């Protein structure tokens, strides 16, 4: 401790004075830091946030300057532990509140799935969301992300459950590597299927052993990997989406009265599927908010019938259960002895199934599983697994989203193409039916125009892809009986069908692709040269060196805001400060005026 | 080293004509353009290869009797009696044909697979010709611009 | 150009007032500000 250059002799002897001397000249430093560090850490953090407040309020005082050099000598330990938020409320001025950030919270924020959730939220809030509901979406994202972090940190009857739980946890933790291993095994199986040949009799001929059984081994391994991927997804990401839906429906019940006064429409299948379990037993299973039922009862009971509310919201004939639990409640209760199964609620289970089967990602994984199963029958169905890269990469996802983007326009322009091709087909069937002789010797003429359906099929199949109209493939007129009309027919065809409509379709896809790419790069540029919370701009902070970067990493950090919300939730209220209680009241009343809209500490003070 | 190798084979002095591409400004611009969208170009070429492989597999399975690239024979030069040969033939002919793949292989002219063959060719001439090649062309031209 | 003119007309009807045309950001201060301003204060149906 004296040669590590971090202690002077006085400090070394003072710390040796704290020794134990357990009759053998020995201390256990484990015990030492287990006893002498935690309260020291807590009170040091308190005095550290005090000195930080004093500094960042009152600058440029030499006495405070030496106090501040000592402060920062302490702060070199408490830098990743204190977070600062810029609230705007209760004083019409920007207030820098300070709070504690847990190491467990930092780790769960470092976790991967929260990072992908964060990038997805950023993307879909900068692209679709504007500024009216930006703070709404941000608070919703913070709630979903703290639930994600709780789940990630969570990641005879005492012999199988305790092991299968660990198995599910391992699958949820190893979901992504399972996906990459699946893509590897699919690439390997498709390479082996590429090394193939034919005799009517299928045979892997281009090899000499060591390749036929490995195909089946890789097939069964790919299938088990698909099953493991699906099972891990069902316990890693399904809790999140079901929590999001539970939160949405519970807040719609409480605030708006969606199934109390404002019954949903006929086409919103989401409304009906939520009405399915607005009255189940364990309705808020993941929203951690198990009193929304009583809340909506107290809110809409004295106007629409307390009995009707308790009937349509579940928990029937229990309007006095609150009083029964408040006065002489039951201590506990054993699970069962004759009922080992069927304890779960079949309605809520069916609702969870119906909600996960419309997730648009569990559906993709189920398609992956069924394609593997069908490949077990016919090995060539493992080629559909090569499209996994299209969803795994970013630019290929962009190409697919582009081919889906201009959907209605693409369908309508293809329809106009079909109609104009049908017009040309009808006029050719009427007048120019003797030129469609697709034969060289015959002598049986293969007239492609002696039938409307055949002529229309031939047209829309040959004239659109010929690249030069339709007359470069059927016989030239060379006769002054219809040559001018035939010529006009072909130039009009090569105009409207080839160099116009196909060009318009090509431009539709390419412009959709370009627009998607431009939206992505614009989201990136806005995240790089504009603040998320306030959005004052970049040039205002481009005055001191590293100004905007420090402003975005210290003052207006989204991670800091999320950690502050988590701290307020786990703060054990009646201990909140003034600003903390104010922000908590605003968050409970769902107002969000405490976010700095168009001002900050630097714009408010010196 | 190109000059030294040209001392062995005089035709290696043709690589020295690319010095103008580095000496001028707009040719340096064209080269920097062909190198600019590197990752995007590689990925779109990969997607082209994958969709061509999809068409190759479906043609090898179903429409293998139309790939007879012979005029008199009588030995049929079946370009589809092999996966690697059919994939090579596809990615070599159908991408550069400018009009899909069916303008170079025999027409169905028979109500046993004509509609599926027609759909195959319009889908090919769509996705491979007037989409993916167009996207690649646009990538280079937009990088240059 | 025709498509861009159509979408520009749509964007001007969505993010700009018809009568006064002060703009959108001025009313984007209170919640639902521009929508209430266009549906209550400066409604073309109201003027008619
Ligand atoms: Ca208090
Ligand atoms: Zn800011
Ligand atoms: Zn107005």
Curated annotation (Swiss-Prot), chain B:
Changing residue 100 to A: Strongly reduced calcium channel activity. Abolishes ryanodine binding. Channel activity is modulated by phosphorylation. Phosphorylation is increased in failing heart, leading to calcium leaks and increased cytoplasmic Ca(2+) levels. Signal peptide: none annotated. It is found in: Sarcoplasmic reticulum membrane. Residues 94-103 dip into the membrane without crossing it. Disruption phenotype: Embryonically lethal. Embryos die at about 10 dpc, due to defects in heart tube development. Cardiac myotubes display enlarged rough endoplasmic reticulum and cytoplasmic vesicles that contain high levels of Ca(2+). The chain crosses the membrane at residues 4-24, 43-63, 124-144. Highly expressed in heart, lung, cerebellum and brain. Detected at lower levels in adrenal gland, stomach, thymus, esophagus and ovary. Cytosolic calcium-activated calcium channel that mediates the release of Ca(2+) from the sarcoplasmic reticulum into the cytosol and thereby plays a key role in triggering cardiac muscle contraction. Aberrant channel activation can lead to cardiac arrhythmia. In cardiac myocytes, calcium release is triggered by increased Ca(2+) cytosolic levels due to activation of the L-type calcium channel CACNA1C. The calcium channel activity is modulated by formation of heterotetramers with RYR3. Required for cellular calcium ion homeostasis. Required for embryonic heart development. Homotetramer. Can also form heterotetramers with RYR1 and RYR3. Interacts with CALM and S100A1; these interactions regulate channel activity. Identified in a complex composed of RYR2, FKBP1B, PKA catalytic subunit, PRKAR2A, AKAP6, and the protein phosphatases PP2A and PP1. Interacts directly with FKBP1B, PKA, PP1 and PP2A. Interacts with FKBP1A and FKBP1B; these interactions may stabilize the channel in its closed state and prevent Ca(2+) leaks. Interacts with SELENON. Identified in a complex, composed of FSD2, CMYA5 and RYR2. The calcium release channel activity resides in the C-terminal region while the remaining part of the protein resides in the cytoplasm. Belongs to the ryanodine receptor (TC 1.A.3.1) family. RYR2 subfamily. This is Ryanodine receptor 2. It comes from Mus musculus.
